[PDB]
Amino acid sequence: SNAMVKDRQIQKTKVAIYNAFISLLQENDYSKITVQDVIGLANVGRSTFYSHYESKEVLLKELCEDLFHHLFKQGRDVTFEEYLVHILKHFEQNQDSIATLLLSDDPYFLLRFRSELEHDVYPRLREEYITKVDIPEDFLKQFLLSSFIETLKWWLHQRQKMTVEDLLKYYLTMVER
Amino acid sequence: SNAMVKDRQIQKTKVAIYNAFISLLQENDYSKITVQDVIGLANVGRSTFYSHYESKEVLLKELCEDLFHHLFKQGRDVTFEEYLVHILKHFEQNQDSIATLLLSDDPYFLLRFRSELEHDVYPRLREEYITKVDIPEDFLKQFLLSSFIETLKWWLHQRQKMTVEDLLKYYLTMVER
Numbered sequence: 001s002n003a004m005v006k007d008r009q010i011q012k013t014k015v016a017i018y019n020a021f022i023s024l025l026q027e028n029d030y031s032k033i034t035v036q037d038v039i040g041l042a043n044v045g046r047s048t049f050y051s052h053y054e055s056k057e058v059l060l061k062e063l064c065e066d067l068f069h070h071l072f073k074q075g076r077d078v079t080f081e082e083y084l085v086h087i088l089k090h091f092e093q094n095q096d097s098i099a100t101l102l103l104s105d106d107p108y109f110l111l112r113f114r115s116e117l118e119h120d121v122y123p124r125l126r127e128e129y130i131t132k133v134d135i136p137e138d139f140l141k142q143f144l145l146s147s148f149i150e151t152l153k154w155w156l157h158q159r160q161k162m163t164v165e166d167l168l169k170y171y172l173t174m175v176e177r
Numbered sequence: 178s179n180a181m182v183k184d185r186q187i188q189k190t191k192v193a194i195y196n197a198f199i200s201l202l203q204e205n206d207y208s209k210i211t212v213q214d215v216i217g218l219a220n221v222g223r224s225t226f227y228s229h230y231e232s233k234e235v236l237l238k239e240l241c242e243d244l245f246h247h248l249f250k251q252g253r254d255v256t257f258e259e260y261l262v263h264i265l266k267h268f269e270q271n272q273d274s275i276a277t278l279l280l281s282d283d284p285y286f287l288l289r290f291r292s293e294l295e296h297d298v299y300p301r302l303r304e305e306y307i308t309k310v311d312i313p314e315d316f317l318k319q320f321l322l323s324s325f326i327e328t329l330k331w332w333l334h335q336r337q338k339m340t341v342e343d344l345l346k347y348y349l350t351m352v353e354r
């Protein structure tokens with residue numbers, strides 16, 4: 001219909017902003033970009049942006065929300081380490097600036113990300129790779145999660161990076177117990 | 178000896194500021210500190226503060242050469258483990274505000290610190306505790322250093338900290354591959 005077409009048009013403009021925000025997050029810190037940057041790409045004016053997004057803050061939120069739903073909140077039937085590999089797969093191509101988001105140190109992205117790791121990566125990592133029990137649980141939790149995040153950051157700064165499977169390997173052997 | 182008297186007054190003023198700077202670092206962190214606050218505590222004039230230190234940076238500099246010379250490059254006749262106990266012992270007590278520098282996240286301290294581990298802790302840690310060329314060196318090095326620094330940071334953010342003995346032990350039985 002004639003409302004069918006206007007809808008299809010508000011849906012394409014919402015995506016333009018979304019995609020603009022991502023492309024700009026490839027070159028800049030979240031703290032460093034401004035709504036005018038976001039328009040200058042989206043080609044949609046100040047008034048309409050604010051009709052979809054209360055502020056820049058809900059793009060980060062939405063984005064993350066999306067990025068983390070695709071990484072973890074999958075019921076995609078695979079082995080634990082296929083699951084790890086897929087996660088790492090996204091980082092190495094910087095699927096939607098996810099790498100740049102992590103390397104930027106944006107405190108908010110680093111927070112919600114560490115929290116997903118706690119819910120969907122740690123419990124399996126624990127039960128499946130750590131066999132002994134002479135190291136307390138909290139030290140375990142902290143050493144494991146933090147060394148995962150740090151292995152990952154280091155790999156992303158690497159100009160010549162190992163295959164995701166090599167890194168997943170060298171990490172799992174480093175921590176297994 | 179009135180030039181001997183003059184030197185003596187210079188010296189007393191200089192450490193008087195240096196001590197104040199350390200004191201302010203116990204709570205507030207480096208970036209949030211001013212000449213006002215240092216001189217208020219050191220009970221000194223702004224003109225005199227400046228004939229001693231170009232700025233609050235040359236203080237951070239000097240404080241840093243001091244702490245590491247002490248922590249690391251000491252030719253004390255101890256075994257590698259005693260050595261690390263002494264380093265951990267400093268952070269446990271916040272000796273010269275050192276625990277607070279680290280937890281402050283200040284680029285300058287952190288950068289200098291890491292560089293010192295790299296040079297004085299990593300070589301022995303890896304030789305003494307790693308007996309498996311199963312893993313490539315660079316990966317090995319990145320992983321040990323980050324695990325140390327973060328286990329350090331983690332321990333320090335603890336409400337009821339564990340003993341430096343338990344920490345070093347759990348750390349070491351964790352990387353020992």
Ligand code: NI
Pocket residue numbers: 070086090
């Ligand atoms: Ni995918």
Ligand code: NI
Pocket residue numbers: 263267
């Ligand atoms: Ni000492």
